[PDB]
């Protein structure tokens, strides 16, 4: 393992000498620059070399015909054009009850529930992820929205706050239910 | 040693027909664009005519044209044959 | 479509094949074999892992540099052409029309360094009445790979190979196109063609025999101390080989006082290590070898290092 | 039955080998072109092309995805993947084993790579891939500079002095702060001195003396 | 009508949102029938639906609809003469493609459309029938049945108005046919669109170059017999008179280049108007004005016709723009060969005036190297300047370099190793390195060659080679001995012209001979210099130290480095032994390859190859035998064995048939190169006729009478046959069938060869 | 889509009359209008090579054998005009842009006039002028006597079309789906009606109406001066009273009424056999086919069929019936009389 997430090739480019710009001699102009190739520094900081994960960002998946997947923040949103909401919420419940995840709290009235830790089994990665999720059903466009929010994410004990995973494993949960439906 | 050719071609008559008070567009029109300029501070058009056929040595005329700020008043400095 | 080696000019056409054979430089006993023929062969897949092919062929073979030695003049000798004794340059030539058929099996996972799947080819050849020497041979080669770890980086693999030839109708097998053993893909301890009946002039040099059996077993291990980028171009395995080849024509003891080469009991077993590295200039093969049980008048290659082929 | 072929292809991408995953994804894309997951299948196919290193089809898939999807949140991935593909095509050669310097060879892949990385760093400043992009850009510029210096050095050994000063001026206008231009500067000085132009030579000498080395 | 709700029925692919977006009427609107009709024909105008109904439920407005069937497959059946993918390509463009839907009103139009295509390519009997198969989930598979119509012959071509040139000669110089010969079944009685324009153009050119000033085609007719079984092409032309030529005029700004223009524009008074001569003089004046920098001129040539004298004069109006200076010469393509070697081979510098032939000499020099597959020069202009141009080159690499290296070590046997490696670009640096190594058990051959074709930048090349070889004779007891030879050579070569090379160098050669059975030739060499060995007893020895000096002259002028199609090549090398040695001789040998094409495509080329070479000793010394010349085998003269031509040795007790070679060799081959219309290059098939001759110039006939007298070279060998050459990623290979029609008793013939060659 | 099998022979009257002499070397695979003509006990006939044999009406006697082919001396004239005889001249047209006028007796007098293109049309005699419709959209008019007055009308721009005459006017078809009427002195009065959306669109004028077919197959009737009263439904039709008998481009034989095109009926048992023109002969319809059979058709409703193989090549030229004889020319290049 560990290979699938890193860029191919050496990291030698990282070592490259710092661009020092030469100071002007007395009474002589240097065409400082004309063309492109100028470089803006932002200091990041993001991962560099192998450390950077290059796995394809998970996309929220809409199995149902005419279903909208939108993702923002820690929330995966699946919109589906149906009649009533109060009946789909427990279909979701049947799916998750088939998957046997642990339910810390629940609420049929608010149609929302809070799960315990969820342990994933991905081959592409070495240290498995834990997810705490709140899952809820809220109709917004007279068609309902199944929403998944990754409350707490944990990579082998240490709580993680990197961006990609938040998506990839919010979306994991999303694709789990979507598939289930 | 193959024939080395360098710079832009010049003739007596074309090098004679530039005088003080000409704009940059006419001299450029009458001699072509300068292959080398001065990128340091001033602006002077260097018209070097260097050619060196094998085992014969060099003949070179250097036409250095120094402008005003606004591309008029072409001072004409001619160094005909090198030493 | 055409390959010039130290052995052959093999021109292949798309089937017109002309093959030049010169064992004067090569490890077989000295003879020259220049051959031209054309065959056409219809293959038929059955299940996208197995196929057959029927083929009719014509083959001419000509031989003009026969070093005189018995157990090759016998092939001439049954044929009617009387042999000349102790002459340098003889010449005979015959045509063979030949039907060939085979079966192949593949289930290999990838193209280089397999870790799972199978491989077999099973191929045989019978001439048609209308040729002037009828004979029978049939052969199989088979490789298979089975991992023992969940990452497919510890994998035992074995291969065995089996060859048999015969002559029916009262006529015997041509001494050319005979099986050989000993090269660096049959038993990596010996020289190229060293397992076999010996040449016997009118010496230690392996002419070959009509039946062959071979089997290898090898344990692929991961390479411990390899660089970062190079993970899958560097294979390292350990292996013990054995193989045998023996003849069927000369099993009578009419030439007494010679090992007579009809007893495959001497098994010729040799264990050593292999390292097999795809480099950006070519493939490399490297064997440290020990003839763990060897047989008299045979040649050894303890350290073999080839770049190419 | 696309759901099962997709589950197979995702379990073989996460766990199994590359050739099988690429084959499965291409099959799924051919069978269902306008699928519900028609984006992520092309994404995974691109990833598989890049990792298996058949490069022409990787580039063709990148360009297809860009033409068809000009607006998507994860466009940084396809942009940095085209940059990776171009740089791999540039510096994928066997001279690395021998260790002979590879600045003289044709720089056209480096040009496109630089272009793509610059576009990336301009458009999307707060993405994950900025630091590696900046490092790649700096290395590529240093390369291109050394290439220019090489050509200048050749024309110095040949002798054609106008071409020399022209190439050094181009290098100083394009790559102002890099190691190759400093080194080259004495070549420009020499070229000026060789012809009888004793005004530019003194300026070049002053600039050299200003930046000691 | 108050709409409090909108409800849908029949939606499948089209989601609620798209429909709801499409409608003018909206929830909460007060609606009349007008607003419903608009809504209906609005919904219909989205391309999504087949039939639609917008009706009023109790309070709700119900939109009923059935979506168009979704294409899942497009299959093709009977389309002999059109690619499925191309046919698909047209279809996806027109509108129909997988994933989209089918307007069931347009199948007719699809059919008629494709049918229309087929009509517009000749087959008026063409019939395309679309079968539409339904599947579940409102899916559909549309199969297009294509039936080619009965072939319609192009029965005849008619030319009305001609009076001096017959019709069948113009049809023999057309491309379209009316009567194809039954013995020539290579062409068919076909009809196309661009071929008609090509025929009109070639007829106009055939009438314009014969000397006809006024000539204009009026109209062309394409008739059809009313069953789509025949096409009639009829042109109606007219011709005025046969004219003459009087004189040329020149006018314009051309910058003093007038003498050569007046010299090349001469025309004979009494010669007539020509069609291809005017455009030839115009392309010549353009190429000449381009040979000084004026790369983009403006030259137009129109004549003013005088009808009273039946003679016309023409003027050319030259307009040469200002000079063009090269600014950047970049190279694209070179992936393993460094940038320096291409700049060294470039002859057009940077920052100078553009010489359009100085830029072509560099292209020819890059082509003649042999590293590269194809080279083309393309001239590109930067738009940021009036007169400044860039020259670019596109190269495609060609790899001919092969590692075969193998070492095999034993305890109980000597170390064996096989090594073949030669390279004409090690790492693109420009060198040539080569090593060969064989040691089976008794022979041992090893040589190392490195050379550098640019040790300076002018072209002064130096290189050297080192070789050692020896073998024990006791493997085949036929005129073989114990030979031990180690030697090193250092060669320096420089060019004195842009074509001709010269090369000098020193060399140390050490030869050791032992265990040679007596035949009279080698002893004739021993009897002059050395000892008096015992006549019937073996185990004699002889060593020699040699300090050779060698000179060479080369004339290389070809187009391509490996498959040359023009020019010729001359090679002359010769070595002399300096005083301070053991034996003293001089050898002279001369290669000559001449190529001449006959056409302007450069496909059928004649190939002449000539090889001459001569040897003699100094001052009674007698030209050591082991250095002699052998002919025979492929690539020297085909249709024999290797090294079989020449004299044959005379053993002391007294005759056998081993060939030992001679002092003086003459070989010449004539080859005709023919194409091969099956391969898409690398193949080359030729017929060859070739003569070989080797003899010995010190064979006294006062001693021997029945033994064959060799010194009179009238015993010329010959051969003929077909040769096919082909290059491999292993290397250049050649195999040839040869049948020697004139041979001599003793020539060990053979009829199939295969070796490296070249 | 292919050839239809032959109707049954319920023969009520058998044709067993023929006398044949070959001419020329046939027409071959070209489409042309080479059809013999009879007047005054002499039948004249031609072939592509240029042979022109005159035969007695009874048996084929009274022969003279001219050659009209002309860097070769006797280069093949490519006769494709078809033959007309009136008042003592034979008129023939060529694809080398020549009209020949040969004297009737010996064929010695041969006077020609280069015309503007292929003269693929039947020459038409009238009023002392011979009208030629040319392949490149021209109408050219030659003198009967010497060929001096050549006035020309252009037409826009596959079918040549014969002209006809009525009370001093020429009525002419055209190659652009257009029918035009030109006054045959200089074309003074000229109108032009579009009657279309190859085919010899030759009109015949009964009761001041022009009837003309079209290559897309709508038949139109126009008033001779104006052309307003119109109904709309190789073609060659005839008039013999108040009935039209026609053969369409869909090859089905069908008779129509004279007024409006009621009373259609189909006899398509000869479908796609590539029929020639029909003729009225002895109160019955006769039609030829390409595969080499003749067919006789009754007139009441078109039911009976009398089919015989007569000539091995086939028919592609118009039969002619006058003076009690029905003469037909085959692709092989012979002649046949018929009676019944």
UniProtKB/Swiss-Prot annotation, chain E:
State whether keyword Signal applies: yes
The record lists the membrane-crossing segments as: 402-410, 413-423, 432-439, 443-452, 461-472, 482-483, 500-512, 541-554, 568-577, 586-596, 606-616, 663-672, 683-695, 718-727, 729-739, 754-758
Give the recorded effect for residue 228 to A.
Lethal, protein does not accumulate
Q: Name one GO biological process term.
A: cell adhesion
Effect of mutating residue 370 to C: No effect. Lethal
- One family name in Pfam for this protein: POTRA
In Swiss-Prot or TrEMBL terms, this protein is called Outer membrane protein assembly factor BamA
Q: Which organism is it from?
A: Escherichia coli (strain K12)
Curated annotation (Swiss-Prot), chain F:
Q: Which domain of life is it from?
A: Bacteria
The main place the protein resides is membrane
Q: What topology in the membrane does the UniProt record assign?
A: Lipid-anchor
The Gene Ontology CC terms held by the record are: Bam protein complex; cell outer membrane; membrane
**Entries under Pfam families matching the protein:** PQQ_2
Record-linked SMART domains: PQQ
* Location of the protein in the cell: Cell outer membrane
| GO biological process terms held by the UniProt record | Gram-negative-bacterium-type cell outer membrane assembly; protein insertion into membrane
Assigned keywords, A-Z: Cell outer membrane, Lipoprotein, Membrane, Palmitate, Signal
Which GO terms fall under molecular function for this chain's record?
identical protein binding
Q: Which HAMAP family match?
A: OM_assembly_BamB (MF_00923)
Q: Which family does it belong to?
A: Belongs to the BamB family.
Q: What does this protein do?
A: Part of the outer membrane protein assembly complex (Bam), which is involved in assembly and insertion of beta-barrel proteins into the outer membrane. Nonessential member of the complex, which may orient the flexible periplasmic domain of BamA for interaction with other Bam components, chaperones and nascent outer membrane proteins. Efficient substrate folding and insertion into the outer membrane requires all 5 subunits.
Q: How does it assemble?
A: Part of the Bam complex, which is composed of the outer membrane protein BamA, and four lipoproteins BamB, BamC, BamD and BamE. Monomer. Interacts directly with BamA. The Bam complex has the shape of a hat, with the BamA beta-barrel crown in the outer membrane and the periplasmic brim formed by the BamA POTRA domains and the 4 lipoproteins.
Q: Could you identify this protein by its name?
A: Outer membrane protein assembly factor BamB
Originating species: Escherichia coli (strain K12)
């Amino acid at each position: 393992s560990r290979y699938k997430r890193q860029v191919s090739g050496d990291e030698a480019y990282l070592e490259a000498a710092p661009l020092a710009e030469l100071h002007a001699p007395a009474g002589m102009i240097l065409p400082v620059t004309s063309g492109d190739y100028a470089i803006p520094v932002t200091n990041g900081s993001g991962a560099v070399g192998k450390a950077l994960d290059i796995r394809p960002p998970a996309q929220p998946l809409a199995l149902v015909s005419g279903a909208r997947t939108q993702f923002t923040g820690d929330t995966a949103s699946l919109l589906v054009e149906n009649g009533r909401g109060n009946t789909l919420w427990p279909q979701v419940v049947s799916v998750l009850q088939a998957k046997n995840y642990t339910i810390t709290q629940r609420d049929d009235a608010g149609q929302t529930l809070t799960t315990d830790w969820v342990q994933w089994n991905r081959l592409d990665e070495d240290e498995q992820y834990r997810g705490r999720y709140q899952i809820s059903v809220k109709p917004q466009g007279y068609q309902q929205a199944v929403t998944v929010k990754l409350l707490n994410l944990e990579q082998a004990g240490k709580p993680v706050a990197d961006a990609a995973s938040m998506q990839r494993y919010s979306t994991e949960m999303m694709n789990v239910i979507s598939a289930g439906l | 040693r193959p024939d080395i050719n360098q710079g832009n071609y010049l003739t007596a008559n074309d090098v004679s027909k530039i005088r003080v008070g000409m704009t940059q567009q006419q001299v450029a029109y009458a001699l072509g664009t300068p292959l080398m300029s001065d990128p340091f501070g001033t602006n002077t058009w260097f018209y070097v005519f260097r050619q060196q056929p094998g085992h014969e040595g060099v003949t070179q005329q250097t036409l250095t044209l120094t402008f005003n700020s606004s591309g008029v008043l072409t001072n004409i400095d001619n160094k005909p044959a090198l030493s | 479509n055409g390959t010039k080696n130290d052995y052959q000019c093999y021109a292949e056409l798309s089937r017109l094949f002309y093959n030049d054979f010169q064992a004067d430089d090569a490890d077989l006993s000295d003879y020259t074999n220049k051959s031209y023929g054309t065959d056409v062969t219809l293959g038929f897949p059955i299940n996208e892992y197995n196929s057959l092919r029927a083929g009719l062929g014509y083959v001419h073979n000509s031989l003009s540099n026969m070093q005189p030695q018995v157990a090759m003049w016998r092939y001439l000798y049954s044929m009617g052409e009387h042999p000349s004794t102790s002459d340098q340059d003889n010449s005979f030539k015959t045509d063979d029309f030949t039907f060939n058929y085979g079966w192949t099996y593949n289930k290999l996972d990838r193209g280089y360094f397999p870790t799972d799947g199978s491989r077999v080819n099973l191929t045989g050849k019978v001439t048609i009445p209308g040729s002037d020497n009828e004979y029978y041979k049939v052969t199989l080669d088979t490789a298979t790979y089975v991992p023992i770890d969940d990452d497919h980086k510890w994998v035992v693999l074995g291969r065995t190979r089996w060859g048999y030839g015969d002559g029916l109708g009262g006529k015997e097998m041509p001494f050319y196109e005979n099986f050989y053993a000993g090269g660096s893909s049959t038993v990596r301890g010996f020289q190229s063609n060293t397992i076999g009946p010996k040449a016997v002039y009118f010496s230690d040099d392996a002419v070959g025999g009509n039946a062959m059996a071979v089997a290898s077993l090898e344990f692929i291990t991961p390479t411990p101390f390899i660089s970062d980028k190079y993970a899958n171009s560097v294979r390292t395995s350990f292996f013990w080989d054995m193989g045998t080849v023996w003849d069927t024509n000369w099993d009578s003891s009419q030439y007494s006082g010679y090992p007579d080469y009809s007893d495959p009991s001497n098994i010729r077993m040799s264990a050593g290590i292999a390292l097999q590295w795809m480099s950006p200039l070519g493939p490399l093969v490297f064997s440290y070898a020990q003839p763990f049980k060897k047989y008299d008048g045979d040649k050894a290659e303890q350290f073999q290092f080839n770049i190419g082929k | 039955p696309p759901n099962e072929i997709y589950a197979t292809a995702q379990q073989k991408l996460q766990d199994g080998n590359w050739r099988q995953a690429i084959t499965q994804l291409e099959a799924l894309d051919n069978r269902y072109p306008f699928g519900p997951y028609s984006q992520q299948v092309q994404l995974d196919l691109i990833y598989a092309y890049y990792k298996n290193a058949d490069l022409p089809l990787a580039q063709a898939a990148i360009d297809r995805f860009i033409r068809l999807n000009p607006t998507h949140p994860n466009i940084d991935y396809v942009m940095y993947m085209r940059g990776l593909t171009n740089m791999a095509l540039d510096d994928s050669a066997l001279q690395g084993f021998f260790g002979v310097d590879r600045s003289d060879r044709d720089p056209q892949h480096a040009r496109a790579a630089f272009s793509d990385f610059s576009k990336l760093v301009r458009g999307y400043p707060n993405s994950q891939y900025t630091t590696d992009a900046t490092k790649r850009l700096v290395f590529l510029k240093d390369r291109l500079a050394k290439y220019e210096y090489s050509v200048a050095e050749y024309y110095t050994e040949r002798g054609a002095w106008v071409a020399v000063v022209n190439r050094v001026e181009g290098m100083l206008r394009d790559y102002p702060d890099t190691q190759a231009t400093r080194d080259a500067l004495p070549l420009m000085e020499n070229a000026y001195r060789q012809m009888q132009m004793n005004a530019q030579a003194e300026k070049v000498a002053k600039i050299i003396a200003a930046n000691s080395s | 009508f108050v709409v409090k709700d909108i409800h849908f029925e029949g939606l499948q692919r089209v989601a609620v949102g798209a429909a709801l977006l499409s409608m003018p009427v909206r929830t909460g609107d007060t609606v009349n029938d007008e607003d419903i009709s608009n809504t209906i024909r609005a919904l219909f105008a989205t391309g999504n639906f087949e039939d639609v109904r917008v009706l009023r439920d109790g309070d709700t407005l119900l939109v009923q609809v059935k979506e168009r069937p979704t294409i899942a497959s497009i299959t093709f059946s009977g389309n002999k003469s059109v690619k499925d993918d191309m046919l698909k390509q047209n279809l996806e463009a027109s509108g129909v493609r997988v994933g989209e839907s089918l307007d069931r009103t347009t199948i007719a139009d699809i059919e008629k459309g494709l049918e229309d295509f087929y009509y517009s390519v000749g087959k008026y009997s063409a019939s395309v029938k679309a079968v539409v198969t339904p599947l579940p989930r409102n899916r559909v598979d549309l199969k297009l049945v294509f039936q080619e119509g009965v072939s319609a012959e192009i029965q005849q071509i008619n030319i009305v108005g001609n009076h001096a040139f017959t019709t069948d000669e113009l049809i023999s110089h057309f491309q379209l046919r009316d009567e194809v010969p039954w013995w020539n079944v290579v062409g068919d009685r076909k009809y196309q669109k661009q071929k008609l324009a090509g025929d009109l153009e070639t007829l106009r050119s055939y009438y314009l170059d014969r000397g006809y000033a006024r000539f204009n085609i009026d109209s062309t007719q394409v008739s059809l017999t009313p069953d789509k079984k025949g096409i009639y092409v009829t042109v109606n032309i007219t011709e005025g008179d046969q004219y003459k030529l009087s004189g040329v005029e020149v006018s314009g700004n051309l910058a003093g280049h007038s003498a050569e223009i007046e010299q090349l524009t001469k025309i004979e008074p009494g010669e007539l108007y020509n069609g291809t001569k005017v455009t030839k003089m115009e392309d010549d004046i353009k190429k000449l004005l381009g040979r000084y920098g004026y790369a983009y001129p403006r030259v137009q040539s129109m004549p003013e016709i005088n009808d009273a004298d039946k003679t016309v004069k023409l003027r050319v109006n030259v307009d040469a723009g200002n000079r063009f200076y090269v600014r950047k010469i970049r190279f694209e393509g070179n992936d393993t060969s460094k940038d320096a070697v291409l700049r060294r081979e470039m002859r057009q510098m940077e920052g100078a005036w553009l010489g359009s032939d100085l830029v072509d000499q560099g292209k020819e020099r890059l082509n003649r190297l042999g590293f590269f597959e194809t080279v083309d020069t393309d001239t590109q202009r930067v738009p940021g300047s009036p007169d400044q141009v860039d020259v670019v080159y596109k190269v495609k690499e060609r790899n001919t370099g092969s590692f075969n290296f193998g070492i095999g070590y034993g305890t109980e046997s000597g170390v064996s190793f096989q090594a073949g490696v030669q390279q004409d670009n090690w790492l693109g640096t420009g060198y040539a390195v080569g090593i060969n190594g064989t040691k089976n058990d008794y022979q041992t051959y090893a040589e190392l060659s490195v050379t550098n074709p640019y040790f300076t930048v002018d072209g002064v090349s130096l290189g050297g080679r080192l070789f050692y070889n020896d073998f024990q004779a006791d493997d085949a007891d036929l005129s073989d001995y114990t030979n031990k030879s180690y030697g090193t050579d250092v060669t320096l070569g420089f060019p004195i012209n842009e074509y001709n090379s010269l090369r000098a160098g020193l060399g140390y050669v050490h030869n050791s001979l032992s265990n040679m059975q007596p035949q009279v030739a080698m002893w004739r060499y021993l009897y002059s210099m050395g000892e008096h060995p015992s006549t019937s007893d073996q185990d004699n020895s002889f060593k020699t130290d040699d300090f050779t000096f060698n000179y060479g002259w080369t004339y290389n002028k070809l187009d391509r480095g490996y498959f040359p199609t023009d020019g010729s090549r001359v090679n002359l090398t010769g070595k002399v032994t300096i005083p301070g040695s053991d034996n003293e001789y001089y050898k002279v040998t001369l290669d000559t390859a001449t190529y001449v094409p006959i056409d302007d495509d450069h496909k059928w080329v004649v190939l002449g190859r000539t090889r001459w070479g001569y040897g003699d000793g100094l001052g009674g010394k007698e030209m050591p035998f082991y250095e002699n010349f052998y002919a025979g085998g492929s690539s020297t003269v085909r249709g024999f064995q290797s090294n079989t031509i020449g004299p044959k040795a005379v053993y002391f007790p007294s005759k056998s048939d081993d060939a030992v070679g001679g002092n003086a060799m003459a070989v010449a081959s004539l080859e005709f190169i023919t194409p091969t219309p099956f391969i898409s290059n690398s193949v080359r098939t030729s017929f060859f006729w070739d003569m070989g001759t080797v003899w010995d110039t010190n064979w006294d006939s006062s001693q021997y009478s029945g033994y064959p007298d060799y010194s009179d070279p009238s015993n010329i060998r010959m051969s003929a046959g077909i040769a096919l050459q082909w290059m491999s990623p292993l290397g250049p290979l050649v195999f040839s069938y040869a049948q020697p029609f004139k041979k001599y008793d003793g020539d060990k013939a053979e009829q199939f060869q295969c070796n490296i060659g070249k | 889509v292919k050839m239809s099998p032959l109707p049954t022979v319920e023969n009520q009257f058998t044709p067993t009359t023929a006398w044949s002499t070959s001419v020329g070397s046939g027409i071959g695979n070209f489409y042309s209008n080479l059809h013999p003509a009879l007047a005054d006990n002499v039948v004249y006939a031609a072939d592509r090579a240029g042979l022109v044999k005159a035969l007695n009406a009874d048996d084929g006697k009274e022969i003279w054998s001219v050659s009209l082919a002309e860097w070769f001396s006797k280069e093949p004239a490519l006769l494709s005009g078809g033959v007309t005889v009136s008042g003592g001249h034979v008129y023939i047209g060529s694809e080398k842009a020549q009209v020949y006028a040969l004297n009737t007796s010996d064929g010695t007098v041969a006077w020609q006039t280069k015309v503007a293109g292929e003269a693929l049309s039947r020459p038409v005699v009238s009023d002392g002028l011979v009208l030629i419709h040319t392949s490149n959209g021209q109408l050219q008019a030659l003198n009967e006597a010497d060929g001096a007055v050549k006035w020309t009308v252009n037409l826009d721009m596959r079918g040549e079309s014969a002209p006809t005459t009525a009370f001093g006017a020429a009525v002419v078809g055209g190659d652009n789906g257009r029918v035009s009427a030109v006054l045959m002195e200089q074309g003074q009065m000229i109108w032009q009606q579009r009657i279309s959306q190859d085919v010899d669109t030759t009109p015949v004028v009964v009761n001041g109406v022009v009837f003309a077919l079209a290559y897309n197959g709508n038949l139109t009737a126009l008033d001779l001066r104006s052309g307003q009263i119109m109904w709309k439904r190789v073609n060659d039709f005839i008039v013999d009273g108040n009935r039209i008998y026609l053969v369409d481009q869909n090859d089905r034989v069908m008779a129509l009424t004279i007024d409006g095109g009621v009373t259609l009926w189909t006899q398509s048992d000869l479908l796609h056999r590539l029929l020639t023109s029909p003729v009225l002969y002895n109160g019955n319809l006769v039609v030829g086919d390409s595969e080499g059979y003749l067919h006789w058709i009754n007139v009441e409703d078109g039911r009976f069929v009398a089919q015989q193989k007569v000539d091995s090549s086939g028919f592609q030229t118009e039969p002619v019936a006058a003076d009690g004889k029905l003469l037909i020319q085959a692709k092989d290049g012979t002649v046949y009389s018929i009676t019944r």
